[PDB]
Design a binder for this molecule. Sequence first.
Ligand SMILES: [Pb+2]
Ligand SMILES: [Pb+2]
Lengths: 309, 307
Amino acid sequence: GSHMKDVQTETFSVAESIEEISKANEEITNQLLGISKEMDNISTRIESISASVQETTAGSEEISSATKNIADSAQQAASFADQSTQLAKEAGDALKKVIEVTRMISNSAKDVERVVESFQKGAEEITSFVETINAIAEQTNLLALNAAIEAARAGEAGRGFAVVADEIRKLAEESQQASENVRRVVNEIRSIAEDAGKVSSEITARVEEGTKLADEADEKLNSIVGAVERINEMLQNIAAAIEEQTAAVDEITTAMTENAKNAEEITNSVKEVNARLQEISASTEEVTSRVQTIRENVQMLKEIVARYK
Amino acid sequence: SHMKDVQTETFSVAESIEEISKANEEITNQLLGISKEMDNISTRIESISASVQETTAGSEEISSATKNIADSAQQAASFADQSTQLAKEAGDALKKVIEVTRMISNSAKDVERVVESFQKGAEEITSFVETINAIAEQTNLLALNAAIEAARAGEAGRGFAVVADEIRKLAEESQQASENVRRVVNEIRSIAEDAGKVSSEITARVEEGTKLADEADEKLNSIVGAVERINEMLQNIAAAIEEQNAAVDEITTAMTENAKNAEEITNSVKEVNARLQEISASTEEVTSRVQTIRENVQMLKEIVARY
Ligand SMILES: [Pb+2]
Ligand SMILES: [Pb+2]
């Protein structure tokens, strides 16, 4: 009696307990389903993260190639800056030596007023020397004609006097013709002498206007040098940017190989996780199959209580 | 007698609780491995996040540099402009020196002409020395000839011996003017040879003034070529600047998703770790009920003997 009424109380508790194990094991199989969906999310995301790595490598490759173009285009631009700097120092040295030439044009052209006025001096000098010869001539002429006219008034012997006096008068007026000719040339000499002072004033004016006008290009040449040394200063800043770019691109490629090495280990850990889950599912399967061998046996004790008890 | 089926049933319920316990132990061990493998995904993820920040930072200064280069280049482009403008004038002020030069080259031509009119003006003037002198020496002899006979006639030579005399004397003054002219013409003649240098030392010195200015000419168009290569070279970096900005835009958008996915993974580790904890609990629910059945399978084997 109490021998079977306890065999019942007993099988009541085990039938009651095994049923809790069945749901505790049902709760477990569910959690396993959720874990998998999360393991696949890791997997899928670990695939996109891997794709994120390829895009970037492409960017480091474009950047580098781009920084190489910039490092070379600049390395060559700077070289023309020294060529422009040299053609400047050169064009500078040339132009400053044209002034030296123009300054020699100063003293050398100066020696001209000595010449223009030395000839201009032979004006009243020669003109007065000639004006005197005119006076002498017209006086010999009047003097000569007077003997000739006065001598002729006597007669016989006056013939002889009138002849010589008249030939002297003829020569007297030959000197007057000579003097009126030596005059036109001394007057021409005048203009060609005076109108010449007008050129000494033009060459001196053109010496100064052309000389300082040369030193306008010299400053302009100086300004390109400055302009060019600023350009070089600019290429130099560009070198430094390039250096920063080469360093920054590198640390990026290291950070990117590091991602491939970490995404791989997650993929492998996910792999290990999945296996471990497939083994959890195994043991969970063994509890389900054994919850049968207990329930069957827990109600097989029922018909033994109905009879014996 | 039938405590036959009590034993055959209290035998099976003892042989199964035995496997549940074992299955529950396998479950517990695996659970401990997953947590372990789980906490490792966390570490690698933290490391992936760092790489993302290192890349973003790297990608950022890559941008500062690109802008810095874009600016520096722009400015250099200006300076080259300021340079070409000065190459227009450097050539300009010279297109003025060649014209000032050709003006003075001709003003120098004016002088040989001057000096030529003087040399000719002096050779023509000497024949007048010759002519006047001659005429004066003829007048002299003639006036002497008149005196050597005017005194003769009779008391009629009175005024004729007087005139012949002053004629001779007048003719003696003409010799003087000529000798003084001869003196000055000579001074004038030597002026010509002295003037020679200034005359051609000019076309000579203006000549090489033109040479030096023309060398500065070529040395100057050669810069507009040198500064032309620089613009072309500078033009090659502007084009590289568009790639870099594009390259940083491709890199930022990549790193942007990589940040998302890293969070999406961390968030998944969080779910799993919590789900694992629910099963540990379920594992314990089972380990507690394994005991209750053992007691209830032991108290039953007591019946097997008792009865
Ligand atoms: Pb850095
Ligand atoms: Pb198992």
